[PDB]
């Protein structure tokens, strides 16, 4: 019927002045474009079929040709930036926004999907989709008392499209657009579907990545308890964006960081810092470094949740990227922590795994470790226990490692290493 057609056959059928012949050639195009291996996107573009598909989107008296062009165009917009640009250049943005008002759920849905692919390309197409007024009709589709009345697949597509309108950074989405989307997005973050939750979390992770004003916008909507609750999910596709969003929030103000702690996020970190997935471990340790960079009372809540032995362990054995975040977490801890807090760190066995990381061929981690050691020696100076820590560093072969760093390429490494040896050894 409409299977294994050539581009020239589709061109013949679409160039006819027969709607049904156009409908069959459009179905044949969609099928060609749906295929898994090397669909001929560029061939369909070069043939000049995109304006033809876009014009078929307006054919209200033929709902199947609306669906088929919509699907065809969606798959062209899912390709490269030049391929998404072609769909936009064909004038498909206003055409797809009008389609959101279709009385046919499958056409309405295809429009939502295509707008998601266009917005997902980057900031410029994201903002162009917003300028053409996509947000109002998309949010009107979710204006129901209970989200559970909408079809699963339909709700998943809307949430994913909305997350792409929250995505990309130079620039970030317009503040007005973010403010209009946020109430629906919070409502989706409480919906009982795992894919809806994951995509809702991604959207929140995108909105919290940037200035503190943007973190504040999100935090004021009271999403932090829900993000902590999702941070404990058994589904990795939910934990990954949840931890991202929590990670972002703690890059902001101490007050914003505190909201995360108050919601009980640190209770989840014993598992997070031992998670089998490297990215979760790395992101959890990074989230930890920005918490230890906080107030002394925040460092105290880390101690209280027994998280210092968990940092000792990641420092001892983890992926080098996670171990790099762990060094940062210790340097931040020792920078703003009390003498009692720093003494507790040495007692938990921080010196040995900290010294073993001085063998690394990364200058930045060496710099971070040497600053942490300096901060630990300052706490030892205040108690008159400098010799105790000096022998402690000599016993685990720490001193030798600093001895070799005196003859290093980096100046900041060369200075700090030579300074510790003349001041304490």
């Amino acid at each position: 019927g409409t299977v294994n057609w050539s581009v020239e056959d589709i061109v013949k059928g679409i160039n006819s002045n027969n709607l049904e012949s156009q409908l069959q050639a459009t179905q044949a195009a969609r099928k060609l474009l749906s295929r898994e291996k090397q669909p001929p996107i560029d061939n369909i573009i070069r043939a000049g079929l995109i304006p033809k598909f876009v014009s078929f989107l307006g054919k209200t008296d033929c709902s199947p040709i609306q669906f088929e062009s919509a699907w065809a165009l969606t798959n062209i917009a899912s390709g490269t930036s030049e391929q998404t640009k072609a769909v936009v250049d064909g004038g498909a943005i206003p055409a797809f926004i009008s389609l959101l008002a279709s009385p046919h759920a499958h056409i309405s849905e295809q429009a939502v999907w295509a707008l998601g692919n266009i917005a997902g390309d980057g900031s410029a197409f994201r903002d162009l989709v917003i300028k053409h007024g996509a947000i109002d009709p998309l949010l009107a589709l979710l204006a129901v008392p209970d989200l559970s009345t909408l079809a699963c697949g339909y709700l998943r597509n809307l949430t994913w499209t909305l997350s792409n309108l929250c995505r990309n950074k130079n620039p970030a989405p317009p503040l007005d657009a973010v403010e209009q989307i946020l109430p629906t997005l919070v409502r989706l973050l409480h919906h009982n579907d795992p894919e809806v939750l994951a995509d809702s979390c991604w959207a929140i992770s995108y909105l919290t990545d940037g200035p503190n004003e943007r973190i504040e916008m999100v935090v004021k909507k009271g999403v932090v308890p829900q993000l902590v609750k999702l941070l404990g999910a058994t589904e990795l596709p939910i934990v990954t964006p949840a931890l991202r969003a929590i990670g972002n929030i703690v890059t902001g103000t101490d007050e914003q960081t505190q909201k995360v702690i108050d919601a009980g996020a640190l209770a989840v970190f014993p598992s997070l810092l031992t998670n089998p997935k490297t990215n979760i471990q790395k992101e959890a340790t990074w989230t930890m470094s920005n918490i230890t960079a906080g107030r002394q009372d925040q460092i105290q809540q880390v101690v209280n949740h027994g998280l210092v032995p968990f940092l000792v362990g990641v420092l001892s054995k983890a992926d080098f990227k996670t171990q790099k975040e762990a060094a940062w977490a210790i340097t931040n801890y020792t920078s703003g922590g009390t003498v009692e807090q720093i003494v507790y760190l040495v007692h938990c066995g921080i010196i040995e795994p900290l010294m073993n990381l001085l063998s690394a061929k990364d200058t930045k981690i060496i710099q971070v470790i040497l600053d942490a050691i300096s901060n630990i020696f300052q706490a030892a100076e205040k108690l008159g226990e400098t010799e105790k820590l000096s022998i402690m560093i000599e016993e685990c072969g720490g001193l030798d490692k600093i001895e070799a760093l005196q003859r290093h390429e980096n100046e900041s490494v060369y200075k700090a290493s030579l300074n510790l040896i003349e001041k304490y050894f």
Partner: peptide
Amino acid sequence: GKRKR
């Protein structure tokens, strides 16, 4: 101090 992405 605190570090962004």
